[PDB]
Structure 1
């Protein structure tokens, strides 16, 4: 069974069962510290009481987020979501997404909406996000461009393996102002995403 537990800084030593996944990024050790320094309350993990901490890590995942924007743009941004391989395809990814909803929809956050960036070719994630009530707001061309790739010069060229989806969900207090059904047809540069 899964219980939602705080992610302590020392739990990073207990994340190998989740971190060896190919698509899960092991961020620089400084980056893990930044999130909990400014926003500790949203930095938590998923734990299994059925897994004894003495013999094996019980952490099944950890969620990193942040709050940015002002006035109408005050929102919680989902940075990275991961689930341990032993606990996939059991809707635990949905639970953590809903966990951010009840946490940020009440005080002291009361954010207007939740947004995140997902690669356009990530059909597995796209179906998961759209299932829970999330809706795509715009396509970020060249979001994952490296230094070699350079800054994108035109929005006419689009690649699913390079562009990222500004992938959103509206809250009740937003009145769907920050979401639109035609978000796929809207294109903007990575620098245009400013909060």
Structure 2
């Protein structure tokens, strides 16, 4: 059974059961500290009370977000989502995302929408994100370019292995102003994503 707990700074010692996943990024030590310092309340971990913390890490995942923009563009951004291998395909990943919605639709945040960037090739995440009511707002060409790839010079060449989808869920307060059915046709450069 999953209980949702604050992520404590020392829990990074207890996240190996989460972070050896080939797709989960172990961010620099500086990066984890930043999120707790500016936005402490949205940085939480999923804990299994079924797993004894004396013997094993009970952390099944954690959520990293930021709030950004102003006025109409004031939103919460889903930066990273991970779930321990033992606890996949049991809708825990949905629960964390829903847990943001209750947490960000109310005071003090009252965000207009939640957005996230997902690789265009990530059909597994895409179908997950669609199913909760998120919609693609635009395709971000070259969002994940390496220094060797350089800056994308044209919006005409698209690569599902290199482009990211700007994926959005509009809140009730937004009245769907920040979402669109045809966003998969809209393309922008990484520098045009500004808030």
Give the drift of 1:97: 0.3
CA deviation digits over 1:137-195, x for unaligned, max 9? 00000000010000000000000000000000000000000000000000000000000
- Separation in 2 of the partners of 1:143 and 1:96? 25
Gaps of 5+ in 1: none
CA deviation digits over 1:56-84, x for unaligned, max 9? 00000000000000000000000000000
Give the drift of 1:7: 0.3
Give the drift of 1:2: 0.2
RMSD between superposed Cα atoms in Å: 0.2
- Separation in 2 of the partners of 1:186 and 1:12? 38
- Separation in 2 of the partners of 1:173 and 1:6? 27
Q: Aligned pair count?
A: 195
Normalising by the residue count of structure 2, what TM-score does the alignment of the two structures yield?
A: 1.00
Give the drift of 1:27: 0.2
Normalising by the residue count of structure 1, what TM-score does the alignment of the two structures yield?
A: 1.00
CA deviation digits over 1:109-149, x for unaligned, max 9? 00000000000000000000000000000000000001000
Structure 1 residue runs of 4 or more that deviate by more than 2 Å after TM superposition: none
